[PDB]
Amino acid sequence: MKYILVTGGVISGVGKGVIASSFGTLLKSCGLDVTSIKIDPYINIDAGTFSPYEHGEVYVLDDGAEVDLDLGNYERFLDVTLHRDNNITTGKIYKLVIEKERTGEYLGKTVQVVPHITDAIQEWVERVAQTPVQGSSKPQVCIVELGGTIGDIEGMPFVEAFRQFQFRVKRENFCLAHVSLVPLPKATGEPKTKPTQSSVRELRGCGLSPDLIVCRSEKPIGLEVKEKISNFCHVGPDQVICIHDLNSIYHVPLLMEQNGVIEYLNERLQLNIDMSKRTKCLQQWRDLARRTETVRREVCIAVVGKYTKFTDSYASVVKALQHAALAVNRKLELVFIESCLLEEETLHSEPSKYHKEWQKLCDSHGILVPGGFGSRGMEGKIRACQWARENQKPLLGICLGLQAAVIEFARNKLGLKDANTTEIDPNTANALVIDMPEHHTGQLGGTMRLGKRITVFSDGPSVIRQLYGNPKSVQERHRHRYEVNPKYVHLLEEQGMRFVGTDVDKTRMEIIELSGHPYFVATQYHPEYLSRPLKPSPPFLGLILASVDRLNQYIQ
Amino acid sequence: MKYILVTGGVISGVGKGVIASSFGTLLKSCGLDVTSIKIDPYINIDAGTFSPYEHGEVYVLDDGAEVDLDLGNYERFLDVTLHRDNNITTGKIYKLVIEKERTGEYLGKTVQVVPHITDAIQEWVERVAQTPVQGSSKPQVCIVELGGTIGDIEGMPFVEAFRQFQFRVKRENFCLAHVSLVPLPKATGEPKTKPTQSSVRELRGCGLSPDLIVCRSEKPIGLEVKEKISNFCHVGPDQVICIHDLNSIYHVPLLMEQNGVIEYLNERLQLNIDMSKRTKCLQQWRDLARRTETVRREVCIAVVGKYTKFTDSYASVVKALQHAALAVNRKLELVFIESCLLEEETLHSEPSKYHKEWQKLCDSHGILVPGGFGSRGMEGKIRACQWARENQKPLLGICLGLQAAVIEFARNKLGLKDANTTEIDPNTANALVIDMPEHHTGQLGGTMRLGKRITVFSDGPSVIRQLYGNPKSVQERHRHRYEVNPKYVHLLEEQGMRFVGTDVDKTRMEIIELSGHPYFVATQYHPEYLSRPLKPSPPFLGLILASVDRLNQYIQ
Amino acid sequence: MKYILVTGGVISGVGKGVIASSFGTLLKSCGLDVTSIKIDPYINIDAGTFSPYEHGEVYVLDDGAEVDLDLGNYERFLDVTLHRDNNITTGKIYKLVIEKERTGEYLGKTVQVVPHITDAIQEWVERVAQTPVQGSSKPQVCIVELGGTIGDIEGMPFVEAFRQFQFRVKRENFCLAHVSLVPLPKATGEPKTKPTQSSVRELRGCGLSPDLIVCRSEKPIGLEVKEKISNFCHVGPDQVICIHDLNSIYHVPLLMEQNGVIEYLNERLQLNIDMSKRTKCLQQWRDLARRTETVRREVCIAVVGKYTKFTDSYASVVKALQHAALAVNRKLELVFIESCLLEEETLHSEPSKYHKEWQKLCDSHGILVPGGFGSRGMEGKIRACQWARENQKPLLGICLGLQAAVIEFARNKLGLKDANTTEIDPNTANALVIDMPEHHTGQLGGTMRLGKRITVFSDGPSVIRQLYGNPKSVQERHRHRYEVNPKYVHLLEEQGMRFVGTDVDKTRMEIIELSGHPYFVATQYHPEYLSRPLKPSPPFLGLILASVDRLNQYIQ
């Protein structure tokens, strides 16, 4: 095949993920079949035990492998369905090699980093880059992205493995893009090139040589600094790209394409791309990038979550709201509301912030309760569900709203003050939601119902069912272990609550939909993982429509 | 003695100079006698042939050594009078060692970088750090500042020489402060520590270990990032300083002092500083830092120069205007006017910018014509002198205004259209200013009259003479070779021009002062090099006063 | 405690192991309690699957952990009984950390090399250095030896962990000895210092600084090169040791001690060693080092093994023969005989070498058949046992001689040509030795009977039993799975074969001893692992005595 390593420069967070996804969505428009790999140099088998604050919004694949977030970036930009093995980590490699050694497949030899770990890495990359990722099309380009910055101790095995790969795989079949940062200190007033120079030198001291250099700055740098980069890093002034901070990332593919990163790649990897045909293929992205600027309607949605401090803990939620808002042709305006600044405990401590957050929640066309883990801020979600239930305000719950809304409904419509979750209060006599960990080896429901499953709609007219297109079953991605208690089912059904969607066994209620309320859907799965820029998700679409009050008109 | 190396981190321009001057002005307030050295790793004997755009505003010392700009930073913050040897450059070291080798003082030995260049560097630093710099007080601390960033190829001899110095000089007599940059990319939204980590690691790979780490950022970083720095760079959380972008640099000494960099230094170098007395000594700087904030008067001055693109080409001029404006208790507002966007040549090409610059020059309480070299923009200065002469607007000329004003005066008051400078038009029959290079070995006037000389005032009432305090002679620093033609002297004297100050020979007119005009002083020396924050320069003081119309009141 | 890292210089094989054991046997003579750790940067849980050619003579500890060879060097020089955890390997560390991560003890955190792997390494070293290694004496010094050379990619985690350790553990409690090589090319004719300089510089680029530098050369280097080392590596000329290639390694402790490496250590680690008492403690080693030179008797022993190409595949055997030869006051002279140059297959291919090896085996006072694995050269051992049985020549078999001698005895004294080992020919109808792998979890005999077990002597006069001192049971270290077939027992007993020693079940015959032959002992364990320089092993002692014909006289 043909590989494109995308290493990283001064810092982590410069834009490797967006640059890699842009390479992917260019080579995909030009006709090729692209796959991707993300290499995390951390010693973790998978992100299934990470916190959102670490790197943000643990993803979920179809087979059930909690992975990084760039694994979702790739899917949203390429419309592919990656697998568990598209995420290499130091832990995976070392565990594989250790198991092989113990079982004796390295029979009588000193297993050392070079060459055994790097041969494991190369065989992993070569075996994964050929797994059919979009049906039955054998891939043709593989965008490997190396996490972290060049120079770390954790990423020495990978830089060495690729230093050998670039010769093992016939260098005409291997590019390398080095994304770097060009700071512009406000005190001085001129962009500085020493960081990129030092990073390029450190990358050369490891053998590799940058075939491209993407200079990521805040404002467009002039031509003086491009000449300085080209000279002091020894690359042609046409293979140094400048990508400043654009408005939306749907502009990065186009900004690179107008800098000839299709011409350069087709010359450097010999891809045989027909330019006389590639013109009218990157059109949906121009359309999207223009709709990103030509919307003035200001629909404001409330996100009442726990981790609302770093704006990457909800990357999937935010990028699934933006897709729907762009599809309806309204302009999104997100407000982030903590769920702990909604209980009386801060009313006694900080009434100022209490009232400020409650006001923000009040003047907002819609409410969204994300998922999460733990007991902190769980009662604030109950408060928000109660408010949106008694104020006729649209609301959507994803895998934890379906819990924090049944809890409310029960407590404040049937009086069971004892209602709670088996996690929150294990000694409750009213367990409205109980776990179902009967696995013992994973064949029953049991452990976290990870991956994609089957959800069939029960009978009856339902707004969310109409939204999906009235099919019989849809497959979404669950990351839950609990469930609604099957003895409060009728107790909550002889009230304003419904139960439309569930599985084949019919003992896992997963789509609740209040009656009389304009929009009070809440689902047990994660509908945000299946959203794509040209194919938004039906629950978020319904939330936005019912929020700007166009839902019935859209239905008709 | 005791040495304080101040190396540099991610970029050049982070603040090494201000941090070093702050160390100096703290240890000077605590009673010690501080000297300084600046180490430029460029191969240049001196800056006497540099351009302002390279590093900015070639300085001039008392003996006549054109040096860097940090050599003026040190003087303005410590009130010392440095020498030629307070500026090491790779060129100086290599030329010294090569001359020694050729003359045979390394008799029969292989002169190599280690140890001969580094021994030359160490002997230079030790011999210079003991030269009485403020009269007869033998210094006690030496603030060596290493230019450039750690990792460059040019600064390997110096890092090695100091790696050996820290053992040759009894490590209890040697600190090290490492100024580094902590970027905060707007796309991500969190300060990043990887650059400082990488720089500290690269500095450790050279032997040295940071005794301090000054983290220079744009906005104050929280405590999370301070803990991250302290951990991932292995320094105590009390020896990591944070200096954000303050308003004026008179705040940096105080901001460091309140972070205990006096306590830490007195503990680490064993300086025997009496804290029960050091309290009421750093008071002039608190006064200045508060006067920097509590002025609201908006006096606006025009700077019509050539290099007005990078705001360091006039560092001395700007910092000499700010001193006077602070001493008068007005708030400065500088406007930078190109001298080439004032001739008809842009009127024919860009009348928009032509009129914009002329308007900026029009609505400004004062005019200042700096010095410079060459013929570009020399006629725009004539235009500005003419405008300020026919509009009764105060003006000051420094070593090139004294030329561009005599040129105007002659041309537009006696009609000698042929008037020009021997540089501009060598074939002129009217040479109003002629060179005086009769040196042939430097003993006559001859070459650039560098250094400080004697200027006696001729007889007669003069505003500038009254400003200086009516002394008989003052010593300023000249950097000129030309002079007023001694045959147009009376021709320009039987008009609105005067000649008050000159040397002992009386054939070098160097202070002109128009009659009838409120303020049209112009001088042949550089009065900006002798300005200090608590002692402004008389010409700039007079310019500001006559600009805000308080000159006569101040005189009385 | 107090730690002594012993890193390595230009090459691997320079002498780290002997230098570390010498530190140990000095600090042990001075009264302290020393332990040891060996750090192998290879990714292998243990050497239990290594080949002798890789590093040489897989060792066996008391609990049953096949380890490196330096783990036996330590025991032979310190008389301690190390454990499984005294051997760190990259595999052990990474598997430990991965298991911890998966079970969740790093709850929600990004497990990365720094700091998690290096904290695992430091906690391992600190927890192991306090395990009572010689009964109940808590250790006081720990000699950590870092395998490999400084600069390898495999040994970056360990160098980083120790860079942090030297500060975590109060630097007055941490030394560092850097063993380096000083080549002397025959073409040039002068010892070269550039390799040691480069290695010391590379070690400084990692933070650590050599407290000692042991210069290992071939012939004693003069004082010029010691001065060059001291200068160009910045260490005092009294902390640079020179250890040339001595005759026997019992000289290295004394050669270091006369260079004041006791004084330097007691000054640098503050050990409180009483020199007025340490004089008459290092006396057994002077005695041994002199007996190494003052023996002239030339006893020649035959070693018929398979791996006789690199003179480290039998390190334990050779060092157990030398101990006995020194205890008898004879001078050893080993001959290494391949066991494959003894079959007719080379008689048809290389009769020259065939006859040469057979002659070497012929003119040798004794024969020794080591252990091993596989089928190659297994018949040559049968040939040698037959020759030594029909020529009345002493012979000793260790864990494979007990097989290759019963095989012979059966085949050539009862005619069972079908006799063989279940490994050699699985389809044999005469299986004289059959496996016993009935473990299925390790509680039965089952898998390799690793570690030390119990061996009781059955009744009857036996030379080997008299040699051991006529005790009832002795514990040796087995590494075997096979066993003598329990149905040929009486068939071989009504002949010139005996069975004296066995376990408590009496179905594992492990000490055979022919009748009429002067010395034909063969044992199923490995008696060479329990030999010490001042306490030789009884089987090897008996072999040497019966070889030089003094066995009966020694018995009396």
Ligand SMILES: Nc1nc2c(ncn2[C@@H]2O[C@H](COP(=O)(O)OP(=O)(O)OP(=O)(O)O)[C@@H](O)[C@H]2O)c(=O)[nH]1
């Ligand atoms: N609390 C909790 N976290 C889990 C569990 N299973 C997986 N996790 C993950 O482990 C992470 C815990 O790391 P933390 O940084 O302490 O995050 P947290 O538990 O939510 O704590 P806060 O961020 O302060 O609310 C969570 O964010 C989850 O993503 C679980 O059963 N309980």
Ligand SMILES: Nc1nc2c(ncn2[C@@H]2O[C@H](COP(=O)(O)OP(=O)(O)OP(=O)(O)O)[C@@H](O)[C@H]2O)c(=O)[nH]1
């Ligand atoms: N032009 C000129 N420069 C001199 C002379 N002597 C010293 N210099 C220095 O050398 C520098 C020339 O470098 P340049 O970068 O070309 O600056 P410049 O000559 O002013 O050219 P511009 O910046 O484009 O106006 C000047 O800035 C002076 O500081 C001289 O005689 N003529």
Ligand SMILES: Nc1nc2c(ncn2[C@@H]2O[C@H](COP(=O)(O)OP(=O)(O)OP(=O)(O)O)[C@@H](O)[C@H]2O)c(=O)[nH]1
């Ligand atoms: N052959 C063999 N080796 C084993 C076995 N179990 C452990 N080993 C070890 O694995 C090593 C195999 O590595 P090799 O380099 O091929 O050594 P070898 O098998 O003896 O092959 P040669 O050295 O050519 O005789 C052996 O030396 C043993 O130390 C086993 O069951 N069979």
Ligand SMILES: Nc1ncnc2c1ncn2[C@@H]1O[C@H](COP(=O)(O)OP(=O)(O)OP(=O)(O)O)[C@@H](O)[C@H]1O
């Ligand atoms: N050119 C750009 N303009 C505007 N925003 C951008 C641009 N590039 C990236 N971003 C934003 O910056 C955020 C971080 O970028 P990205 O995820 O690519 O960092 P990263 O280097 O991939 O981080 P990591 O290596 O940890 O995965 C993204 O959410 C993205 O939306």
Ligand SMILES: Nc1ncnc2c1ncn2[C@@H]1O[C@H](COP(=O)(O)OP(=O)(O)OP(=O)(O)O)[C@@H](O)[C@H]1O
């Ligand atoms: N803490 C600060 N707040 C505001 N401005 C600052 C601060 N530190 C430095 N500056 C400004 O930044 C400019 C450049 O700083 P400085 O001259 O110290 O850089 P430098 O590292 O010394 O450059 P060089 O190494 O090339 O001499 C100075 O003019 C100074 O006024």
Ligand SMILES: Nc1ncnc2c1ncn2[C@@H]1O[C@H](COP(=O)(O)OP(=O)(O)OP(=O)(O)O)[C@@H](O)[C@H]1O
């Ligand atoms: N000073 C010396 N004089 C004579 N022989 C020596 C000396 N030092 C070591 N040797 C011999 O060299 C051989 C290899 O030495 P050693 O085992 O110490 O190497 P090493 O560096 O420990 O190897 P590794 O790091 O692979 O364990 C040993 O068998 C030892 O007998």
Ligand SMILES: O=c1ccn([C@@H]2O[C@H](COP(=O)(O)OP(=O)(O)OP(=O)(O)O)[C@@H](O)[C@H]2O)c(=O)[nH]1
């Ligand atoms: O104060 C200084 C700073 C730097 N130098 C030396 O002169 C050269 C200055 O070069 P710089 O490091 O200042 O900038 P740059 O052009 O290399 O890259 P950017 O920061 O613009 O991105 C470098 O070679 C430095 O070693 C000095 O001599 N004095």
Ligand SMILES: O=c1ccn([C@@H]2O[C@H](COP(=O)(O)OP(=O)(O)OP(=O)(O)O)[C@@H](O)[C@H]2O)c(=O)[nH]1
């Ligand atoms: O996408 C990534 C980025 C980084 N990593 C790896 O996990 C760790 C992330 O650490 P970072 O490099 O992202 O940040 P930092 O804490 O080291 O310093 P600052 O930027 O905040 O100033 C690093 O060890 C990296 O190698 C990943 O696994 N994936």
Ligand SMILES: O=c1ccn([C@@H]2O[C@H](COP(=O)(O)OP(=O)(O)OP(=O)(O)O)[C@@H](O)[C@H]2O)c(=O)[nH]1
């Ligand atoms: O041919 C040469 C070789 C070396 N040199 C340069 O002169 C110096 C010679 O120094 P060397 O490298 O030749 O020897 P050394 O003293 O450094 O260490 P040993 O090899 O003796 O152990 C070094 O600085 C080298 O760069 C030459 O100029 N020419």
Ligand SMILES: N[C@@H](CCC(=O)O)C(=O)O
């Ligand atoms: N702890 C709950 C919440 C899931 C979520 O929404 O994140 C569960 O596992 O079902």
Ligand SMILES: N[C@@H](CCC(=O)O)C(=O)O
């Ligand atoms: N070239 C003129 C101008 C000097 C200046 O003002 O910079 C001289 O040397 O006199």
Ligand SMILES: N[C@@H](CCC(=O)O)C(=O)O
């Ligand atoms: N393979 C035989 C030989 C053992 C040996 O002597 O090394 C066993 O395991 O018993």
Ligand SMILES: [Mg+2]
């Ligand atoms: Mg980070």
Ligand SMILES: [Mg+2]
């Ligand atoms: Mg990424």
Ligand SMILES: [Mg+2]
């Ligand atoms: Mg938690």
Ligand SMILES: [Mg+2]
């Ligand atoms: Mg620069």
